[PDB]
Amino acid sequence: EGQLAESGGDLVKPGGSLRLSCVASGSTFRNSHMTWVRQAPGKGLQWVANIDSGAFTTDYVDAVRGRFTVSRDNARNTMYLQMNSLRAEDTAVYYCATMKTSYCIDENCFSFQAGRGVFDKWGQGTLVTVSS
Amino acid sequence: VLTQLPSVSGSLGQRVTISCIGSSSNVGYGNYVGWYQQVPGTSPKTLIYDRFSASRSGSTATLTISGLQAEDEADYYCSSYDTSLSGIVFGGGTHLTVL
Amino acid sequence: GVGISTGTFNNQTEFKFLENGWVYITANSSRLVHLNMPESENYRRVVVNNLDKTAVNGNMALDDTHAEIVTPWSLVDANAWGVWFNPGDWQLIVNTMSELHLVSFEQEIFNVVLKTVSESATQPPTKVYNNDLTASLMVALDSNNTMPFTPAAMRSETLGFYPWKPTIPTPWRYYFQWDRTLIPSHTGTSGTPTNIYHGTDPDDVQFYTIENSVPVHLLRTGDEFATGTFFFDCKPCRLTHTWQTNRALGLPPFLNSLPQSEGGTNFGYIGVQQDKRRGVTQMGNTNYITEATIMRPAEVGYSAPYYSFEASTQGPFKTPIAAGRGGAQTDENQAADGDPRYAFGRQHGQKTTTTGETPERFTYIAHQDTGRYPEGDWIQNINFNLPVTDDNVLLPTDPIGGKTGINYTNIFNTYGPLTALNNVPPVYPNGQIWDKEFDTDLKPRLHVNAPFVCQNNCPGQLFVKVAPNLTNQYDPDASANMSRIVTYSDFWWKGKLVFKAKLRASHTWNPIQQMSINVDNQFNYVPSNIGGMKIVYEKSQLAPRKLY
Amino acid sequence: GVGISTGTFNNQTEFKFLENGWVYITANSSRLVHLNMPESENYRRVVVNNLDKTAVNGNMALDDTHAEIVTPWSLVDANAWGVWFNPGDWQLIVNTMSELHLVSFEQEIFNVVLKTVSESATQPPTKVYNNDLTASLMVALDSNNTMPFTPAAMRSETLGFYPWKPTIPTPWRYYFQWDRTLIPSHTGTSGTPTNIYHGTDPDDVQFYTIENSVPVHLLRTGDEFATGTFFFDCKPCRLTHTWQTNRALGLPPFLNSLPQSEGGTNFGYIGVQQDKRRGVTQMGNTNYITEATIMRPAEVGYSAPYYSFEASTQGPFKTPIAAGRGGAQTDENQAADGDPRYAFGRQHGQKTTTTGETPERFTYIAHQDTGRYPEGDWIQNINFNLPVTDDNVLLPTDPIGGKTGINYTNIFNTYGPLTALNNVPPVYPNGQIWDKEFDTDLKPRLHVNAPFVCQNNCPGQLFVKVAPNLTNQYDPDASANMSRIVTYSDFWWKGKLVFKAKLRASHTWNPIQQMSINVDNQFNYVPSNIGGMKIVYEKSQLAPRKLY
Amino acid sequence: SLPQSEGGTNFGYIGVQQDKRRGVTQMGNTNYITEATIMRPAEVGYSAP
């Protein structure tokens, strides 16, 4: 089965800008809610952002509000995270993941309902650091 | 941020429970709950979307692991969706030590 | 046999002139239909879910969730105007005819070719197309209408409109029942509304198969097929539009002061003060007689909720409306609910040399002024004190339910025993010709998609399928997909559709509107230097007829 | 001709209603049959001898030893319900029909396609397929029933039950005569029980060849074969079941004390002491008249030695029983001797997408109550002194021959002149439709495999083969196997089976059991998302009828 | 895009992005064609107060 692949993570000067990429393989990317999560070394998993299948809405955490910008391109079958105004706190490993939009009720899944809060698949990840 | 236990430990082959004790309008409310496994340097793996089991259990969810082995001696994370923030939130994570 | 043809190509349109101003219109269509073998011989029950799109709050209008049986058969659908008439024939029909009767329809398949693709294992790949003189094409005609009716015009999947371009059929599928609930929300709505796919109700399950319900003919390269002639019973259509609204019905008021000089601003005056006038009104407590209050025989058109979505067993659906918007002719940007919008591809009108997935779209602004202008509507109190005070009038500028962007017109309905309205006008080329009447106990007065609705029955859908061409290694106890030789078919489909029309008479002094090729639209009706062709849309009810 | 189809595909089931509630059912079945060339053109004589499995003491019931003739011909057999009816038609039949008659049968083979496979010398394996137009297919209808009767339903080898899936014919073989002794034993029996295959008795040898007994038709790609209608003379079949055992035949005793309040806690009382009662009994030395001792007109059902194996020249075989068990209707796990168990593959009802050699199996628990409940039987001394003492009563808890697991019922036969029983109920889809009566001087009263049995004869078997397609090096003086061009055939088999049925009537106040789709079984009757199909077993004799 | 394995979570997909789709709608000011906006022959049932 197809998997995601992150790229663009690296040490960069504080206060600069960068752009992380997440290539998607498989036909489900156009149909999937995409999310970015970040994990500081030995710290707890931290949600970064989510964007729906049709780019209708975008959500972020306050820690990245007005600083990060999530976008997607179905023609390129890829997601991007523009990390402008980099700050020391951005040093972490960033993953792109799929949010499960449908959860089946019966164990054999003869009935489905919408939901949020579970990530179905995870990418490889890329390391970002903020220092001179 | 949801409250999650610091760590738990148990011998091989036993049964353990890792609890997520978030509040209402959060994991402790009608929203779904998710659990992930990760060893430092590896992407989290979604356990419950076979020996594992899970239960939201009202205001505090729980993951019942069983068949502890050398593998699975890893960290486990709890996630959900919070309405007061209208966004995905995570627990602090919990480590498992397999004796 | 093998070298003897089984039919003749024919795409001519004939106008046989009868007595008493009637014309027998014979539209012959002929196409080269190309059909690949199906993806899998097994019927599938597929649940399409777009719960990702709908989960976004406020996006409920974009629901596509459903369940459908997908079949190995392909549908040959010719129920579209563009399949039968070129722009010139339509010009003649609309400019000269006043009414159009659907008479008969027959179709046939001939010159069946079945071919097999053999791909070599040579390091540079190569493939050769051999013939198969024994393979068969399965043709099923559902003359008893035992199968769900699926008009392809609604998806722009009918045969092509160009006689010289080969066309393809559409894979056949039909809805399988399902239970689905979607509670609406809006942007900023907290939490996740109830959005659920409930499965299937056993009492409604229906799994149709062509093999069990229809006789299937096997056509080898020397065989032919003909459905025979079916005869319609649909009501006659009118190629004339009505302009008289309620304000233009009856005897106008006598003018006591006629104008004395030419000029746009030199108006005439009725003279008698509005409360001293004569006539009849449905206002039993008001002395005013005005063009807005005077009694009229009945109501032309009706008002209905616009962009109203109603939910049921299967989920939400837009409430249809039988008339267009008001004033859209003056400003196309105001074209809205009620004006059908057709999207189509390179087979059905779009420039054949266009690149990209974007389709060609147009909104049909019907000529007939049966629509309404909700911004000019209003309600006022029974007491009828004029000028009306704020508290005694509800306006389109008034919020309903606390919403600033929704007013009473959005939920207003005036369909009543006095309502009168017209049938949907034909849409060329992509409009549907005929449609099947519902099997309900009480049947709808009109269909929003076809000008001809089928009282008893009308021609059974025609299905084609490449018969399986097995390899020696076949083992039916294997769970894997059947091993089939790559096979495809090319066959000529010919149809004859017979209408009857009346030739229009000039009732008035002035000339009437007509369709004409002009410098602005000249190149839409001729090919480009690289052979590109397009079929732009044309209006069908140019001539006006008096309503009353 | 090569390019002309010789037949049409049909799988419709037609109900034509006649006078006085009689309804004429015509089941059309059509299949694309795929046939490979035989492994060898020679009639083999082969003996299977599973001495290794039976050598383990106590495994005698697992015997498979037999001598058989293996032929190059394949048998096209359609003697199963699934081949002719889909679940919905079966629902209609069983729900609305009371009795069923077998009327006629016919079949034809058309649209013969013959192809040959050539494997290239190219290093990466590849192969191509060519239409051998001059090839031939050998058909043979045993119109006189000269060949041994070998129904395929017993081996789950009939044509497929799905019209839209190609099917194969079973390779034909028939039993040859052999002698075999198998002395039974148990785990712990010393030494080796006599276990020997004695060969063949010359006086019983019978070697049948199609080429000598049947006229063979050579069908090329443009030829067709048709058997012609055949007519059955079988007995009628009942789609109803009998609930009355011996305890429910005749006039119930009059109750002198009826209850006064509802509920199961309140019963009735006969009110006359058992020894002071009036009636007729067959117990000439007792005065008690009880529901267990009163005279009933006859005996419904019969006790037979269950799991009894009898040995003859050919070795052990289970004794067949004409009735099911009792108590299995409430607890399926008790389903036991007398209830047929069907094991089948993906052609005949098992899920078409399951992977594995394990067949799908089911035990058919019949609705009729003609069976027995051995744990409730007992014998007692002629004196009949009550309560019976240990020495005067034989119970199922008592052993025979010192065996703690065998009781008297295991060796008990109560078939007699008063025995009344019913015919086996049809089993859908895997049940055999008709069978041939034994050619014995005294014929059996019923057959356990098909509801219809053939008094004189019934339709001849159809054998298909691919005629040898010789190379240029063929040498009949060579001992090695014949060298042939790899060839195969795909031909369409069509069949028409005519039943005659009677519509049922409402005899009682209450409704009766009817087949119906529900949420529990809803998905058994529809395809899966990848095309997974199945046909689950459905009972036949739903309605009750009063036995007396 | 048809499903490739059994089970509920294996749905099918229409493939074409919604605003690039083809069909007839009674909504003359939007390019979106969905099962909720596509034109249907008529209305089954009705809402009443």
CSV table of C-alpha atoms in Angstrom, one decimal, chain C residues 230-509:
chain,number,residue,atom,x,y,z
C,230,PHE,CA,-42.2,1.6,-30.2
C,231,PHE,CA,-44.9,4.3,-30.2
C,232,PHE,CA,-45.1,7.0,-27.6
C,233,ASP,CA,-48.3,8.4,-26.0
C,234,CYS,CA,-46.7,11.6,-24.5
C,235,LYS,CA,-48.5,14.9,-24.6
C,236,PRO,CA,-47.7,17.4,-27.3
C,237,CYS,CA,-45.0,20.0,-26.6
C,238,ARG,CA,-45.2,23.7,-27.5
C,239,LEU,CA,-42.4,25.5,-29.2
C,240,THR,CA,-43.9,28.8,-28.1
C,241,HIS,CA,-43.3,30.8,-24.9
C,242,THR,CA,-45.7,32.8,-22.8
C,243,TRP,CA,-44.9,36.3,-21.6
C,244,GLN,CA,-48.2,37.4,-20.0
C,245,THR,CA,-47.9,37.4,-16.2
C,246,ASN,CA,-50.8,38.2,-13.9
C,247,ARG,CA,-50.3,41.9,-14.5
C,248,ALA,CA,-50.9,41.4,-18.3
C,249,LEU,CA,-54.2,39.4,-18.0
C,250,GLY,CA,-57.5,40.8,-19.1
C,251,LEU,CA,-58.7,44.2,-20.0
C,252,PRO,CA,-56.4,47.1,-19.3
C,253,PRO,CA,-57.8,50.2,-17.7
C,254,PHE,CA,-59.3,52.8,-20.0
C,255,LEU,CA,-57.0,55.8,-20.4
C,256,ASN,CA,-58.8,59.1,-20.0
C,257,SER,CA,-55.6,61.2,-20.9
C,258,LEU,CA,-53.7,59.9,-23.9
C,259,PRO,CA,-50.3,61.4,-24.7
C,260,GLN,CA,-50.0,64.2,-27.2
C,261,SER,CA,-46.4,64.1,-28.2
C,262,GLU,CA,-43.9,61.4,-29.2
C,263,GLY,CA,-41.2,60.7,-26.6
C,264,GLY,CA,-40.2,58.1,-24.0
C,265,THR,CA,-41.3,60.3,-21.0
C,266,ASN,CA,-44.7,61.3,-22.6
C,267,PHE,CA,-46.8,58.9,-20.6
C,268,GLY,CA,-50.5,58.4,-20.6
C,269,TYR,CA,-52.7,58.8,-17.5
C,270,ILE,CA,-55.7,56.8,-16.3
C,271,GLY,CA,-57.3,59.9,-14.7
C,272,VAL,CA,-59.8,58.5,-12.2
C,273,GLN,CA,-58.4,58.6,-8.7
C,274,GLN,CA,-57.5,55.1,-7.5
C,275,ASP,CA,-60.1,54.9,-4.8
C,276,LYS,CA,-62.9,56.2,-7.1
C,277,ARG,CA,-62.3,53.5,-9.8
C,278,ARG,CA,-64.4,50.6,-11.0
C,279,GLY,CA,-63.7,46.9,-11.3
C,280,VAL,CA,-63.4,43.9,-9.0
C,281,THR,CA,-60.8,43.0,-6.4
C,282,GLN,CA,-60.3,40.2,-3.9
C,283,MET,CA,-59.8,42.9,-1.3
C,284,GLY,CA,-63.1,43.0,0.6
C,285,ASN,CA,-62.0,45.8,2.9
C,286,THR,CA,-60.2,48.2,0.6
C,287,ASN,CA,-61.5,50.8,-1.8
C,288,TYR,CA,-58.3,51.0,-3.9
C,289,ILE,CA,-58.5,49.5,-7.4
C,290,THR,CA,-55.0,49.3,-9.0
C,291,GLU,CA,-53.2,47.0,-11.4
C,292,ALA,CA,-51.6,45.3,-8.4
C,293,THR,CA,-54.9,44.7,-6.6
C,294,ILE,CA,-57.4,44.1,-9.4
C,295,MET,CA,-58.7,40.6,-9.6
C,296,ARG,CA,-57.1,38.3,-12.2
C,297,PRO,CA,-58.5,35.0,-13.5
C,298,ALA,CA,-55.8,32.9,-11.8
C,299,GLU,CA,-52.1,32.9,-10.9
C,300,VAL,CA,-49.3,32.5,-13.5
C,301,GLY,CA,-46.4,30.6,-12.0
C,302,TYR,CA,-45.8,30.0,-8.3
C,303,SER,CA,-43.2,30.8,-5.6
C,304,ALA,CA,-41.3,28.1,-3.8
C,305,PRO,CA,-38.4,27.9,-1.4
C,306,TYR,CA,-35.2,28.4,-3.4
C,307,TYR,CA,-32.1,26.3,-2.5
C,308,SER,CA,-34.2,24.3,-0.1
C,309,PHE,CA,-32.8,20.9,0.9
C,310,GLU,CA,-35.1,18.2,2.3
C,311,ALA,CA,-33.9,15.0,3.9
C,312,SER,CA,-35.4,11.5,3.7
C,313,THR,CA,-34.4,7.8,4.1
C,314,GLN,CA,-31.4,8.4,1.8
C,315,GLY,CA,-30.3,11.8,2.9
C,316,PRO,CA,-30.8,15.4,1.7
C,317,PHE,CA,-31.7,16.5,-1.8
C,318,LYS,CA,-32.5,19.9,-3.3
C,319,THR,CA,-36.2,20.7,-3.7
C,320,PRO,CA,-36.8,21.2,-7.5
C,321,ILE,CA,-38.6,24.1,-9.0
C,322,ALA,CA,-40.6,24.2,-12.2
C,323,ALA,CA,-39.8,27.7,-13.3
C,324,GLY,CA,-36.8,29.9,-13.8
C,325,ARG,CA,-35.8,33.2,-12.1
C,326,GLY,CA,-37.2,36.6,-12.8
C,327,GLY,CA,-35.2,39.2,-14.8
C,328,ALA,CA,-32.4,36.8,-15.6
C,329,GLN,CA,-32.7,37.9,-19.3
C,330,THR,CA,-31.5,41.4,-18.3
C,331,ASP,CA,-28.6,40.2,-16.1
C,332,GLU,CA,-27.1,36.7,-16.5
C,333,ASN,CA,-25.3,37.1,-13.2
C,334,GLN,CA,-28.7,36.8,-11.5
C,335,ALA,CA,-29.5,33.4,-13.1
C,336,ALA,CA,-30.3,31.2,-10.1
C,337,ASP,CA,-32.5,28.4,-8.8
C,338,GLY,CA,-34.8,27.0,-11.5
C,339,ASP,CA,-32.5,27.6,-14.4
C,340,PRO,CA,-31.0,24.3,-15.4
C,341,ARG,CA,-27.2,24.2,-15.7
C,342,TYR,CA,-25.8,21.6,-18.0
C,343,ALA,CA,-22.2,20.4,-17.8
C,344,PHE,CA,-20.8,18.3,-20.6
C,345,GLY,CA,-17.7,17.1,-22.4
C,346,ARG,CA,-16.0,16.8,-25.8
C,347,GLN,CA,-18.5,14.1,-26.9
C,348,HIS,CA,-21.5,16.2,-26.2
C,349,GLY,CA,-20.8,19.8,-27.3
C,350,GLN,CA,-17.5,20.9,-25.9
C,351,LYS,CA,-14.8,21.9,-28.4
C,352,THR,CA,-13.2,18.6,-29.4
C,353,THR,CA,-9.7,20.1,-29.3
C,354,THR,CA,-9.9,21.3,-25.7
C,355,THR,CA,-7.5,20.0,-23.1
C,356,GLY,CA,-8.0,19.4,-19.4
C,357,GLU,CA,-10.7,17.9,-17.2
C,358,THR,CA,-12.7,21.1,-16.9
C,359,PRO,CA,-16.1,20.6,-18.6
C,360,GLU,CA,-18.2,23.0,-20.7
C,361,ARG,CA,-21.1,24.4,-18.7
C,362,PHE,CA,-24.0,26.6,-19.6
C,363,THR,CA,-27.1,27.9,-17.7
C,364,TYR,CA,-30.3,27.8,-19.6
C,365,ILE,CA,-32.3,31.0,-19.3
C,366,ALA,CA,-35.8,30.0,-20.4
C,367,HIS,CA,-37.7,32.6,-22.3
C,368,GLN,CA,-41.0,32.0,-20.7
C,369,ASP,CA,-41.7,34.6,-18.0
C,370,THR,CA,-43.3,32.1,-15.6
C,371,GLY,CA,-40.7,32.7,-12.9
C,372,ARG,CA,-40.7,35.1,-10.0
C,373,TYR,CA,-38.6,37.9,-8.7
C,374,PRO,CA,-38.4,37.3,-4.9
C,375,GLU,CA,-36.8,40.7,-4.2
C,376,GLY,CA,-40.0,42.5,-5.4
C,377,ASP,CA,-42.3,40.4,-3.3
C,378,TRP,CA,-43.7,41.5,0.1
C,379,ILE,CA,-46.5,40.7,2.6
C,380,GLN,CA,-48.6,43.3,4.4
C,381,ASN,CA,-51.2,43.2,7.1
C,382,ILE,CA,-54.9,42.5,6.5
C,383,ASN,CA,-55.9,46.1,7.4
C,384,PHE,CA,-54.2,47.5,4.3
C,385,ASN,CA,-53.4,51.0,5.6
C,386,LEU,CA,-51.3,52.9,3.0
C,387,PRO,CA,-48.5,53.9,3.1
C,388,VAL,CA,-47.7,50.7,5.1
C,389,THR,CA,-45.9,51.2,8.3
C,390,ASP,CA,-42.9,49.1,9.4
C,391,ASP,CA,-44.7,46.8,11.7
C,392,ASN,CA,-47.4,45.9,9.2
C,393,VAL,CA,-45.2,44.7,6.3
C,394,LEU,CA,-42.8,41.8,5.9
C,395,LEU,CA,-40.2,42.5,3.2
C,396,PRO,CA,-37.4,40.5,1.5
C,397,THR,CA,-35.1,42.8,3.5
C,398,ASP,CA,-36.5,41.3,6.8
C,399,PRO,CA,-34.5,38.7,8.7
C,400,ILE,CA,-36.3,35.4,9.4
C,401,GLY,CA,-35.3,33.3,12.4
C,402,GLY,CA,-32.7,35.8,13.3
C,403,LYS,CA,-30.6,35.3,10.2
C,404,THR,CA,-29.6,38.4,8.2
C,405,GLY,CA,-29.0,36.4,4.9
C,406,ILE,CA,-32.3,34.5,4.9
C,407,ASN,CA,-35.7,36.1,4.3
C,408,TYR,CA,-39.3,35.0,4.1
C,409,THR,CA,-39.1,34.3,0.4
C,410,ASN,CA,-36.7,31.5,1.1
C,411,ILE,CA,-39.5,29.6,2.8
C,412,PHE,CA,-42.5,31.0,0.9
C,413,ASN,CA,-44.8,28.8,-1.1
C,414,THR,CA,-47.8,30.0,-3.2
C,415,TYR,CA,-48.6,26.8,-5.2
C,416,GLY,CA,-52.4,26.6,-5.0
C,417,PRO,CA,-55.5,25.6,-6.8
C,418,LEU,CA,-55.2,28.7,-9.0
C,419,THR,CA,-51.6,28.0,-10.0
C,420,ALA,CA,-50.9,27.6,-13.8
C,421,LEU,CA,-47.5,26.9,-15.3
C,422,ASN,CA,-45.8,25.5,-18.4
C,423,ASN,CA,-43.8,22.4,-19.2
C,424,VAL,CA,-40.0,22.5,-19.3
C,425,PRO,CA,-38.7,23.7,-22.7
C,426,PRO,CA,-36.4,21.4,-24.7
C,427,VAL,CA,-32.7,22.0,-24.3
C,428,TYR,CA,-30.5,21.5,-27.3
C,429,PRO,CA,-28.2,19.6,-27.6
C,430,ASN,CA,-27.9,18.1,-24.1
C,431,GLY,CA,-31.6,18.1,-23.1
C,432,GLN,CA,-33.4,14.8,-22.5
C,433,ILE,CA,-36.2,13.9,-25.0
C,434,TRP,CA,-38.4,11.5,-23.0
C,435,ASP,CA,-38.7,10.3,-19.4
C,436,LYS,CA,-40.6,7.6,-17.6
C,437,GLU,CA,-43.6,8.5,-15.5
C,438,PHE,CA,-43.3,7.4,-11.8
C,439,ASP,CA,-45.1,4.3,-10.6
C,440,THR,CA,-46.6,6.2,-7.7
C,441,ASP,CA,-50.3,6.2,-7.1
C,442,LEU,CA,-50.4,10.0,-7.5
C,443,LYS,CA,-48.2,11.2,-10.3
C,444,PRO,CA,-46.4,14.5,-10.7
C,445,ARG,CA,-47.8,17.1,-13.1
C,446,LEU,CA,-44.5,17.6,-15.0
C,447,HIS,CA,-40.9,16.5,-15.0
C,448,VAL,CA,-38.1,19.1,-14.7
C,449,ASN,CA,-35.8,17.1,-17.1
C,450,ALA,CA,-37.9,16.1,-20.2
C,451,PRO,CA,-40.7,17.8,-22.2
C,452,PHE,CA,-42.1,14.3,-22.9
C,453,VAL,CA,-43.3,12.1,-20.0
C,454,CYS,CA,-44.3,8.5,-20.6
C,455,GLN,CA,-47.8,7.7,-19.6
C,456,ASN,CA,-47.8,3.9,-20.1
C,457,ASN,CA,-44.3,2.9,-21.2
C,458,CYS,CA,-41.4,3.8,-23.6
C,459,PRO,CA,-38.6,2.0,-25.2
C,460,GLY,CA,-36.7,-0.5,-23.1
C,461,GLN,CA,-33.1,0.3,-22.3
C,462,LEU,CA,-30.6,-1.4,-24.6
C,463,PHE,CA,-27.6,-3.2,-23.0
C,464,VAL,CA,-24.5,-4.5,-24.7
C,465,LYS,CA,-21.6,-6.6,-23.2
C,466,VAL,CA,-18.6,-8.4,-24.6
C,467,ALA,CA,-19.1,-12.1,-24.0
C,468,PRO,CA,-16.2,-13.6,-21.9
C,469,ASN,CA,-13.4,-15.1,-24.0
C,470,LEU,CA,-11.8,-17.6,-21.7
C,471,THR,CA,-8.3,-19.0,-21.7
C,472,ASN,CA,-7.5,-22.7,-21.4
C,473,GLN,CA,-6.4,-22.3,-17.8
C,474,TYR,CA,-9.9,-21.4,-16.6
C,475,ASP,CA,-10.9,-22.9,-13.1
C,476,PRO,CA,-14.2,-21.7,-11.8
C,477,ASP,CA,-13.4,-22.9,-8.3
C,478,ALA,CA,-10.6,-20.3,-8.1
C,479,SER,CA,-11.5,-17.2,-6.2
C,480,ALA,CA,-9.3,-15.0,-8.3
C,481,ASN,CA,-10.6,-13.0,-11.2
C,482,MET,CA,-11.5,-14.8,-14.4
C,483,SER,CA,-8.7,-15.0,-17.0
C,484,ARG,CA,-10.1,-13.5,-20.2
C,485,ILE,CA,-8.5,-12.8,-23.6
C,486,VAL,CA,-8.3,-9.0,-24.1
C,487,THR,CA,-11.3,-8.4,-26.4
C,488,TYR,CA,-13.2,-5.4,-27.6
C,489,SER,CA,-16.1,-4.7,-30.0
C,490,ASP,CA,-17.1,-2.1,-32.6
C,491,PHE,CA,-20.7,-2.1,-33.9
C,492,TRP,CA,-22.9,0.3,-35.8
C,493,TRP,CA,-26.0,1.6,-34.0
C,494,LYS,CA,-28.8,3.1,-36.1
C,495,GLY,CA,-31.9,4.7,-34.7
C,496,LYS,CA,-34.9,6.4,-36.2
C,497,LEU,CA,-37.0,8.8,-34.2
C,498,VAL,CA,-40.3,10.2,-35.6
C,499,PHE,CA,-41.9,13.4,-34.5
C,500,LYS,CA,-44.9,15.3,-35.7
C,501,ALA,CA,-45.1,19.1,-35.8
C,502,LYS,CA,-47.4,21.9,-36.7
C,503,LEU,CA,-46.1,24.8,-38.8
C,504,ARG,CA,-46.5,28.1,-37.1
C,505,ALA,CA,-48.8,30.9,-38.4
C,506,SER,CA,-48.1,34.6,-38.2
C,507,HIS,CA,-50.9,36.0,-36.0
C,508,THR,CA,-49.4,39.5,-35.5
C,509,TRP,CA,-48.2,42.5,-37.5
